[PDB]
Amino acid sequence: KRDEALFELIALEEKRQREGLELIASENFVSKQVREAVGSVLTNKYAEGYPGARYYGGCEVIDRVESLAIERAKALFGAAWANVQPHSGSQANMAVYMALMEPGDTLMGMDLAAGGHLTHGSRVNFSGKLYKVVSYGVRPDTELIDLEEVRRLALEHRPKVIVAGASAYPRFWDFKAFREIADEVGAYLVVDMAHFAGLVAAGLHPNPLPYAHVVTSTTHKTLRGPRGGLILSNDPELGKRIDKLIFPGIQGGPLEHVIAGKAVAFFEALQPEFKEYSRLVVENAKRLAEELARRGYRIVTGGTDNHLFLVDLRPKGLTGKEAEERLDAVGITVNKNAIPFDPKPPRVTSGIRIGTPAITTRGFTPEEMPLVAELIDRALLEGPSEALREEVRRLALAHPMP
Amino acid sequence: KRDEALFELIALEEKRQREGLELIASENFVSKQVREAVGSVLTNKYAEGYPGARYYGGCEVIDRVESLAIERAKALFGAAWANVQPHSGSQANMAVYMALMEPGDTLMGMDLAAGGHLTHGSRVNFSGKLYKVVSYGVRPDTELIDLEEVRRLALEHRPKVIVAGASAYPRFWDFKAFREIADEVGAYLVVDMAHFAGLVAAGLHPNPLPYAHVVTSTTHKTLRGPRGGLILSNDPELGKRIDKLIFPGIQGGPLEHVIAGKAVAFFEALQPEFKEYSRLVVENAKRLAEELARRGYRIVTGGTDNHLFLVDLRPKGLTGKEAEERLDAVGITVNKNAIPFDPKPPRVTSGIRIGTPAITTRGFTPEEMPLVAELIDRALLEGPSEALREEVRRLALAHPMP
């Protein structure tokens, strides 16, 4: 008997994705072949352990799948070791922290209000519950990270782990300087590259692998893979410690169907076409930010080096909750986002974050960003309307989905 | 450009699954429509938060999917609250432990060597790293749990949490007696029903919901759903606390394509045909155990109440490691398992664990269990041969996969 009610909801979600403009910076649209691998019979096999060292027999083909994902990840990022089993970016970070730290050690990460991720030390997250957290932010004038401030805080508090990487920071990171700071205090440098991993893969963002002790990531977001996590290092002895924290430390059976999807995504990212895609992601983001600034919006830091940017909505009298609602009403999806030194609580905020990976996958070009900027501006100034919703829908439908 | 190398391996794994007899008790084969949901475009959406209270716009359809999974889980198991976001059984347990305990509190669970899971207190797992662990086992003379010993340990060590449930225990649990013991020392009772959840759904195993404070599960194994976790309770106030530990406590974005898969599995399990399937699972296991006993093996506890049983190989002078290897060589997968107070070290053991869910899904019936018992016996006594492998392969191919 087919579950018609559930499949009707999936069809409605397909239609929603096709008919809207998805500008949430962490989203993307995966390829049919990634979906085919994730939908495969590999879900049926328990594969606790690692290739050639499994608990149970019958894994000879699964070992070749997992090993292919591991070796492609090493080739793609230039790493000596990879672990492809984490179920999510959160589990990747959790295993690394538990391998390098004991409860009550000091973790240093970027402040949530400045663009850090929940797992970089928030007090409602395991990171800020198990560890003592010290956070760094950005300067109030340039809105850039101040490496002198990072260095001062590290000397004063002597963290065991310093995390670089963030979920809403629009400029490049200086990984060499962060490693120099970590070395001054004997800390490990962990880089969480989840947001910009696909740009690293395409050579469009500095690679952290040579400077970080350990690198974590998601396989979704700019890498355009299935939802899951990933860990890399140039030190295979530290990698063996972390392998034990993934299993048997914090997970049980890995999702081998998802791992097959990660292998496929790494193969897609190794192709020349993925470099061209990634180039257009960054060109579209720069162009859309410029078109919005020409309409009088304030862009945090004045621009972007990567796939995302932040808009300060204080001057226009909007909370980010409000802008998020007005845009959602006409089919444009963003997320509210705290801006640097935000006057308003995190459930309201003063800004929005926009990113271009998802619309670039649908074939949007830099010459189309003036039209996208017009639609955003109208939704914010004039509020939602049926004519505006229809204009968004027409523009979205003119671009294929993968 | 298609990833030919990866899809070649998926076809080889499909062929392996089709041509072999899967007797590992944790395994099952999911339906095509569960795969279709897991392979869907719902992976593209970030949906941090809960239905009606998300951190991203554009979740109106995903909310209906996740709500449908929640309401079907509650109707299927007779629960007042559910959380369908855990990425795995291990994350379901981790969130419950962190919601109920502080690091350094005492956890009581079944010993790994007597059948407990890694997350019931093993020192290599987070459960034995964050918490102090007291374990209970089985009695040498009954091969069963001794509720008087559980009580004595609980009175002496005053655990904060007592876990009931196991990965390799072939008899019913007395959840009422466990809740009495927990009430006497002021502990929470957590039941991990992952292995026998499908039998609870079908009414063939006592339901823990009225007696546990919280129930955790996988959605794969006897429930025959996609790989993932699940939490249930009869107490919605405790459920709100655990919701917060799943997110933002230990996870980030949920896997909503897998959640849609869980919704389909719960739909399948609510059909009358699932009760018939589960009845056959239990009849097959009782019959296979009787047929091996008639050929000279001893069955631990003398039989089974559920989908799995433990074979004591001592009458035939084999170890569990040798039996696993001989059987794997003819395409029959089992796993070695210690017998109570095993005289062999744990990397060797004197037993194997066999379960029937997977072969029952392929249409095996109790009148075919004599033939399966004969093939096992021949492989253990004669050793692998090309002719025996071909007889297994023909028997397997005659029973279709879903």
Residue numbers in the entry:
A (entry chain B), B (entry chain A): 6 to 407
Task: Reproduce passages from the article.
Serine hydroxymethyltransferase (SHMT), a ubiquitous PLP-dependent enzyme in the aminotransferase superfamily, catalyzes the reversible conversion of L-serine (L-Ser) to glycine (Gly), transferring a one-carbon unit to tetrahydrofolate (THF) to yield 5,10-methylenetetrahydrofolate (5,10-MTHF). As an enzyme in one-carbon metabolism, SHMT is essential to the synthesis of thymine nucleotides, purines, methionine, and other essential biomolecules. SHMT is found as a homodimer in prokaryotes, such as Thermus thermophilus (Tth), and a homotetramer in eukaryotes, such as humans. Like many metabolic enzymes, SHMT is evolutionarily highly conserved, especially in the active site, enabling us to utilize SHMT from Thermus thermophilus (TthSHMT) as a model of the mitochondrial human enzyme.
We further tracked the substrate through the active site cavity by obtaining a room-temperature X-ray structure of a pseudo-Michaelis complex by soaking a TthSHMT crystal with D-Ser, a non-reactive enantiomer of L-Ser, which displaced the sulfate anion in protomer A occupying the cationic substrate binding site. The crystal soaking experiment produced a complex with D-Ser in protomer A replacing the sulfate, whereas protomer B retained the sulfate ion in the substrate binding site. Both protomers remained in the open conformation. D-Ser, the enantiomer of the physiological substrate L-Ser, did not proceed to react with C4´ of the internal aldimine thus generating a pseudo-Michaelis complex, TthSHMT/D-Ser. Arg358 acts as the primary anchoring point, forming a salt bridge with the D-Ser carboxylate by making two H-bonds with the N···O distances of 2.7 Å and 2.8 Å. Tyr61* that interacts with the D-Ser hydroxyl adopts two alternate conformations. In the pseudo-Michaelis complex, Glu53* was observed within an H-bond distance of 2.9 Å to the D-Ser hydroxyl. In the TthSHMT/D-Ser complex, the D-Ser α-amino group is 3.0 Å away from NSB but is angled away from C4′ at a distance of 3.5 Å, possibly making the nucleophilic attack unfavorable and producing the stable pseudo-Michaelis complex. Moreover, the Schiff base out-of-plane dihedral relative to the pyridine ring is flattened to 20° indicative of NSB being protonated and positively charged. Because H atoms cannot be observed in the TthSHMT/D-Ser X-ray structure, the protonation states of the cofactor and D-Ser cannot be determined.
